[PDB]
Design a protein around this ligand. Structure first.
Ligand SMILES: O=C(NCc1ccc(-c2ncnc3[nH]ccc23)cc1)c1ccccc1
Length: 258
């Protein structure tokens, strides 16, 4: 077993957590003690040799706001991806649970959690490529962490039109600034309590809306200062969009002011 390889015999499978682009994900214990999530990679769903090589890179990505990859189980099929377990599940579902009665201070903290993870990824020149509330998870302390960063590169209609800047929709130009755009949409999702962006539109109509220069608008729960931050992510010119370091400074400033 290499450093990126976990012995599957050390796993105890306990509960089912959900299903994604690679199949079922389960909750379990590693060595009878430590909580883990276990992705069971359905056959034919993943470019497996490419993912395994990239897993070595993902293992060195370590930040408190990034769902940690613990290792992979590659000797048998289906292969397993072993990650940090996040007791409160997907951020999108969490936002939609009205019982939480969130204060806007909590919503801004969720934005800060994600922005810290994204500043770290940016500092490593690592793109998420599908940043959205569906790819954020929530732990038992209510901390939001960014999950499954980069994994879309290995997945073999469902394109994230609603999280994509004009240059991606028009020319497939992905960059740090397409992650920035997506982060702005994610802030909108958070402050909208999990509403679908451009909810009245199809993907095709969303693409045309964006191409014409029109935009999402201010969620009811976003202050003017918060709206300014999310809107800055949507500049038509990618080079005029902020970095994650600047967004983080702007978020911290708003936390101090509000
Ligand atoms: O596998 C994917 N998505 C399904 C998914 C992912 C994570 C979790 C999960 N991880 C940790 N703790 C948890 N607690 C509750 C859920 C849960 C569950 C399901 C995926 C594949 C490729 C690209 C993007 C996503």
């Amino acid at each position: 077993y290499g450093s990126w390889e976990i012995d599957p015999k050390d796993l105890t499978f306990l509960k089912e957590l959900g299903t994604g682009q690679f199949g079922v994900v389960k909750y379990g214990k590693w060595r009878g003690q430590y909580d883990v999530a276990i992705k069971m990679i359905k056959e034919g769903s993943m470019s497996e040799d490419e993912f395994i090589e990239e897993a070595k890179v993902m293992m060195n990505l370590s930040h408190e706001k990034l769902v940690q990859l613990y290792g992979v189980c590659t000797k048998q099929r289906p292969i397993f991806i072993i990650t940090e377990y996040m007791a409160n599940g997907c951020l999108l579902n969490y936002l939609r649970e009205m019982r939480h009665r969130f204060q806007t201070q909590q919503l801004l903290e969720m934005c800060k959690d994600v922005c810290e993870a994204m500043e770290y990824l940016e500092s490593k020149q690592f793109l998420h490529r599908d940043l959205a509330a569906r790819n954020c998870l929530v732990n038992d302390q209510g901390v939001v962490k960014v999950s499954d960063f980069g994994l879309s590169r290995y997945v073999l209609s469902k394109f994230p039109v609603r999280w994509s800047p004009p240059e991606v929709l028009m020319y497939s130009k992905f960059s740090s600034k397409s992650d920035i755009w997506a982060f702005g949409v994610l802030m909108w999702e958070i402050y909208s309590l999990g509403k679908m962006p451009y909810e009245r539109f199809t993907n095709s109509e969303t693409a045309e809306h964006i191409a014409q220069g029109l935009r999402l608008y201010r969620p009811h729960l976003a202050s003017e200062k918060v709206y300014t931050i999310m809107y800055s992510c949507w500049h038509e010119k990618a080079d005029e969009r902020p970095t994650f370091k600047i967004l983080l400074s702007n978020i911290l400033d708003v936390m101090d002011e509000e």
